Swiss-Prot record, chain A:
Locations listed in the record: Cytoplasm, Cytoskeleton; Cytoplasm, Cell cortex; Cytoplasmic vesicle, Secretory vesicle, Cortical granule; Cell membrane
Organism lineage string: Eukaryota, Metazoa, Chordata, Craniata, Vertebrata
Disease linked to the protein: Macrothrombocytopenia and granulocyte inclusions with or without nephritis or sensorineural hearing loss: An autosomal dominant disorder characterized by thrombocytopenia, giant platelets and Dohle body-like inclusions in peripheral blood leukocytes with variable ultrastructural appearance. Some affected individuals lack leukocyte inclusion bodies on classic staining of peripheral blood smears. Alport syndrome-like features of nephritis, hearing loss, and eye abnormalities are present in some patients.
Purpose of the protein: Cellular myosin that appears to play a role in cytokinesis, cell shape, and specialized functions such as secretion and capping. Required for cortical actin clearance prior to oocyte exocytosis. Promotes cell motility in conjunction with S100A4. During cell spreading, plays an important role in cytoskeleton reorganization, focal contact formation (in the margins but not the central part of spreading cells), and lamellipodial retraction; this function is mechanically antagonized by MYH10. (Microbial infection) Acts as a receptor for herpes simplex virus 1/HHV-1 envelope glycoprotein B.
Domain notes: The rodlike tail sequence is highly repetitive, showing cycles of a 28-residue repeat pattern composed of 4 heptapeptides, characteristic for alpha-helical coiled coils.
Subunit structure comment from the entry: Myosin is a hexameric protein that consists of 2 heavy chain subunits (MHC), 2 alkali light chain subunits (MLC) and 2 regulatory light chain subunits (MLC-2). Interacts with RASIP1. Interacts with DDR1. Interacts with PDLIM2. Interacts with SVIL. Interacts with HTRA3. Interacts with Myo7a. Interacts with CFAP95. Interacts with LIMCH1; independently of the integration of MYH9 into the myosin complex. Interacts with RAB3A. Interacts with ZBED4. Interacts with S100A4; this interaction increases cell motility. (Microbial infection) Interacts with herpes simplex virus 1/HHV-1 envelope glycoprotein B.
Residues bearing PTM Omega-N-methylarginine: R27
Tissue: In the kidney, expressed in the glomeruli. Also expressed in leukocytes.
Name of the gene encoding the protein in the UniProt record: MYH9
Full protein stretch here: 1897 to 1935 of 1960
Protein name listed in UniProt: Myosin-9
Family: Belongs to the TRAFAC class myosin-kinesin ATPase superfamily. Myosin family.
From Swiss-Prot, chains B, C:
Binding site for Ca(2+) 2: D63, N65, D67, E69, E74
N-acetylalanine found at: A2
PROSITE patterns xref list: EF_HAND_1, EF_HAND_2, S100_CABP
Subunit record text: Homodimer. Interacts with PPFIBP1 in a calcium-dependent mode. Interacts with PGLYRP1; this complex acts as a chemoattractant that promotes lymphocyte movement. Interacts with MYH9; this interaction increases cell motility. Interacts with Annexin 2/ANXA2. Interacts with TP53; this interaction promotes TP53 degradation. Interacts with CCR5. Interacts with FCGR3A; this interaction inhibits PKC-dependent phosphorylation of FCGR3A.
Protein name: Protein S100-A4
Gene Ontology CC terms: collagen-containing extracellular matrix; cytosol; extracellular exosome; extracellular region; extracellular space; nucleoplasm; nucleus; perinuclear region of cytoplasm
Residues with the N6-acetyllysine modification: K7, K35
Species of the source: Homo sapiens
Lineage: superkingdom: Eukaryota
Alphabetic keyword roster: Acetylation, Calcium, Cytoplasm, Metal-binding, Nucleus, Repeat, Secreted
EF-hand domain sequence ranges: 12-47, 50-85
Molecular-function annotations in GO: actin binding; calcium ion binding; calcium-dependent protein binding; chemoattractant activity; identical protein binding; RAGE receptor binding; RNA binding; transition metal ion binding
Location in the cell: Secreted; Nucleus; Cytoplasm
Length: 39, 101, 101
C-alpha cells in the first residue's frame, strides 16, 4: 500500500503547470471561475 | 451526505468519463465535453457564464498543447486550478497579501 | 446526494482548512495534518493501513518545493493526482493475471 507513490508523483509535475494554469483560468479571458463561496 | 474528500477523487474520474465519452474518448474532453461537465456539476464555478467565444479561451487554458482536447493530468490540474484558484475566496483572503493566496 | 464534481473542489479547500489548522496554519499541512485528513476522508486511498511509511512517499511527492510542508500548491496537486490515482485505483490491480498459455 502506497498509491500516493505513483499517484502524487505526478503532483510535482501538475504543480508546476497548476500554478500557471490556475493563473490562466483567472487570467480574465476565462468564462469560468470560483465564486466568493461555492455559491 | 457523501464522503467529501473521497467523492472528490471519485467524481474526478467518474465525471471524467461522463461527458468526455460523448464526442470522442472517455478520457478525452474537447471543449463541448468540458462545457457540459461544468454546466452540470460546476455551474457555480462559472462565476458568470461559460460562453462559446469564451470556451475557445477556456479549452486553451486547459490544454498546454492546444489540440482542444484535455488529457487526464490536464483535466485534474484543471480541478486543482479551480480549488487553488478558490483559495483566497473560500479561505478568507479578499485579495489580501499577494503571497500564498 | 451531493453535487459530485462541485463537492470535489469545495471539499478541497474545506478539508484543506479542516486538518491543517490543527498544528499550525489552516492552509499548511504537515505530515500529521495530511495523516488525519487521509485517515478520515481518504481511507480508501490508505488501504486502511497508513503509518508514516505510506505517508512518506505521499508527503515527499507532494512536497514539490522541498520543505516538507504541504502548502495549498502541494495540496491541489495532491488531490488532482489522486484523480489519476483513482482511475487506476478504480480497479486497483487486485492480482490481475491473464493466461495466454
Amino acid at each position: 500500500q502506497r498509491e500516493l507513490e505513483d499517484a502524487t508523483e505526478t503532483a510535482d509535475a501538475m504543480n508546476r503547470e497548476v500554478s500557471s494554469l490556475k493563473n490562466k483560468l483567472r487570467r480574465g479571458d476565462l468564462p469560468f471561475v470560483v465564486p466568493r463561496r461555492m455559491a | 451526505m457523501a464522503c467529501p474528500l473521497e467523492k472528490a477523487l471519485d467524481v474526478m474520474v467518474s465525471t471524467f468519463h461522463k461527458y468526455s465519452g460523448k464526442e470522442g474518448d472517455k478520457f478525452k474532453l474537447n471543449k463541448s465535453e468540458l462545457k457540459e461537465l461544468l454546466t452540470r456539476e460546476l455551474p457555480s464555478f462559472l462565476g458568470k457564464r461559460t460562453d462559446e467565444a469564451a470556451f475557445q479561451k477556456l479549452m486553451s487554458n486547459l490544454d498546454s498543447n492546444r489540440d482542444n482536447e484535455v488529457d487526464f493530468q490536464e483535466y485534474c490540474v484543471f480541478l486543482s486550478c479551480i480549488a487553488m484558484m478558490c483559495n483566497e475566496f473560500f479561505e478568507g483572503f479578499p485579495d489580501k497579501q499577494p503571497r500564498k493566496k
